[PDB]
Design a protein around this ligand. Sequence first.
Ligand SMILES: *[C@@H]1O[C@H](CO)[C@@H](O[C@@H]2O[C@H](CO)[C@@H](O[C@@H]3O[C@H](CO[C@H]4O[C@H](CO)[C@@H](O)[C@H](O[C@H]5O[C@H](CO)[C@@H](O)[C@H](O)[C@@H]5O)[C@@H]4O)[C@@H](O)[C@H](O[C@H]4O[C@H](CO)[C@@H](O)[C@H](O)[C@@H]4O)[C@@H]3O)[C@H](O)[C@H]2NC(C)=O)[C@H](O)[C@H]1NC(C)=O
Ligand SMILES: *[C@@H]1O[C@H](CO)[C@@H](O[C@@H]2O[C@H](CO)[C@@H](O[C@@H]3O[C@H](CO)[C@@H](O)[C@H](O)[C@@H]3O)[C@H](O)[C@H]2NC(C)=O)[C@H](O)[C@H]1NC(C)=O
Ligand SMILES: [Cu+2]
Ligand SMILES: [Cu+2]
Ligand SMILES: [Cu+2]
Length: 496
Amino acid sequence: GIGPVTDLTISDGPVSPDGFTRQAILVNNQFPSPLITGNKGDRFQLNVIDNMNNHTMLKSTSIHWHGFFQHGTNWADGPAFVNQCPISPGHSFLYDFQVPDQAGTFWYHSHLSTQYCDGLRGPIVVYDPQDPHKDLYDVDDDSTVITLADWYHLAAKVGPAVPTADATLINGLGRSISTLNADLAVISVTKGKRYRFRLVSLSCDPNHTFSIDGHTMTVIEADSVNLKPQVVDSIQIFAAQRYSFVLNADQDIGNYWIRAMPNSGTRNFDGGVNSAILRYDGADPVEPTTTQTPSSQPLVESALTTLEGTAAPGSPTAGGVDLAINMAFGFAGGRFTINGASFTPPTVPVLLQILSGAQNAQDLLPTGSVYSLPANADIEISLPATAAAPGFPHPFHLHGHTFAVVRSAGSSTYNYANPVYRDVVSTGSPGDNVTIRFRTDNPGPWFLHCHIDFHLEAGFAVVMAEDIPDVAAVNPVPQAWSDLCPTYNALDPNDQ
Ligand SMILES: *[C@@H]1O[C@H](CO)[C@@H](O[C@@H]2O[C@H](CO)[C@@H](O[C@@H]3O[C@H](CO[C@H]4O[C@H](CO)[C@@H](O)[C@H](O[C@H]5O[C@H](CO)[C@@H](O)[C@H](O)[C@@H]5O)[C@@H]4O)[C@@H](O)[C@H](O[C@H]4O[C@H](CO)[C@@H](O)[C@H](O)[C@@H]4O)[C@@H]3O)[C@H](O)[C@H]2NC(C)=O)[C@H](O)[C@H]1NC(C)=O
Ligand SMILES: *[C@@H]1O[C@H](CO)[C@@H](O[C@@H]2O[C@H](CO)[C@@H](O[C@@H]3O[C@H](CO)[C@@H](O)[C@H](O)[C@@H]3O)[C@H](O)[C@H]2NC(C)=O)[C@H](O)[C@H]1NC(C)=O
Ligand SMILES: [Cu+2]
Ligand SMILES: [Cu+2]
Ligand SMILES: [Cu+2]
């Protein structure tokens, strides 16, 4: 793919991924946005050149590199008004960071408002030259990335505040009910080879239930964390999650349906909606006629475990940490709340408030939304599901960290000995109490929020202000970052 040192030039233009033409956001003249690649420990230098001129889809921008810890580079994490002011139209801004001790499947997306829904979102793969799962497969390359995305015929700021998708795109292609002849994505395999497929959800809202007719999948990585291998025949993947799975192309040469059923919008496969094609070399270039078997081995999150057997942080007892926090979800005045507070973006980004002299979390804006975390501590956060926060199940993402999921959705058990670790978790449905743990090893303000982007826009977020006293020393900011807020604040409102 491109990188790890490359320009990413952002513009507006026409696209037609499901056969319907609409204006959207291009990256290096491409929709969908291009794959970025590098190797474990590389320095990424991603020069984002903002040439957008359409205020309806926002002229300004900021990009989050989803899943990277950003230790010492908190200013590069991406959330607008938490870690930076937006890049302004006609300006460039260099994200310059390293990725020590991570390897797996990631993605990048606009982290300003609901802009990524309008098309600024693509996959990232960070390869490991000693990947512990390499001997399970033969092929892992640009052609084995599989992206899932929601797509809307009206733009994010033009349609309903919580819209309903017209199409699921698989690798940027798919059909809507009015475009049943649109080109489907084709994923090529050769009989007798084994493939590491890297499944990335670029979704703004729906989750997808993914399966491939006639084949099983051996899951080996979740949200960039290596797992013990687990055979499944379907994966429910929530917005912003990733999984690697190995597919053994050991069936008859032919065409097989790839299925990605969303939880909303059109949910069937009639006319080949919500679908793509797995094509064996030597097959007729036509659509599959395969039929779906019910899933008998669906992925179950509580059954996943890390490859390295990593325990949860802290003691193997409820509340056996340094600081435990419960997040009570609600809704008031058309906005989401967490512990009674709705996040509204501040005028001065939270990181710049710290760097300008705010000495504790109580001094930070917005008041009610910011949590102090002590350094070198074990933290436990519970996120009990409730119908009081509409549009559940809500998949929450913690920036700056991987976390142990000690209790998953749909499970009553707590696992401290060998839970899965990941960075986006469904908080499930009423009766659940999804509980996560992490260690504070990364000074800076980090967002924690639902990754349904329309819910984030309606305030469903808090900020974890981790080790405020060390933030300036550990995160020296570059000159170009210091210039973002004065440039942004000088813009006319219609040029934002
Ligand atoms: C910035 O980004 C936003 C968000 O993506 C863009 O917003 C879009 O706005 C339009 C205008 O309100 C929305 O309405 C629909 O527009 C489409 C597309 O129209 C274009 O292509 C047509 C060819 O198929 C063409 O005829 C159009 O040209 C006419 O309009 C322009 C502008 O007014 C004018 O200058 C020309 O002289 C022409 O008169 C245009 O180039 C259009 O197809 C839709 O029509 C359908 O629906 C209406 C009823 O709603 C009906 O009247 C029609 O018969 C038909 O069924 C409709 O007008 C559009 O939905 C928005 N898009 C999204 C994704 O939300 C915005 O345009 C961007 N700005 C720029 C400058 O690109
Ligand atoms: C989801 O799980 C969390 C974490 O277990 C639950 O919150 C915890 O609930 C118990 C009360 O049932 C609290 O214990 C009590 O603490 C008080 C004050 O310290 C003490 O005086 C009592 O004797 C009792 O031990 C606990 O503090 C609370 N934890 C936190 C961090 O807030 C939560 O209720 C669960 N929610 C659902 C819907 O299941
Ligand atoms: Cu993300
Ligand atoms: Cu949500
Ligand atoms: Cu975020």
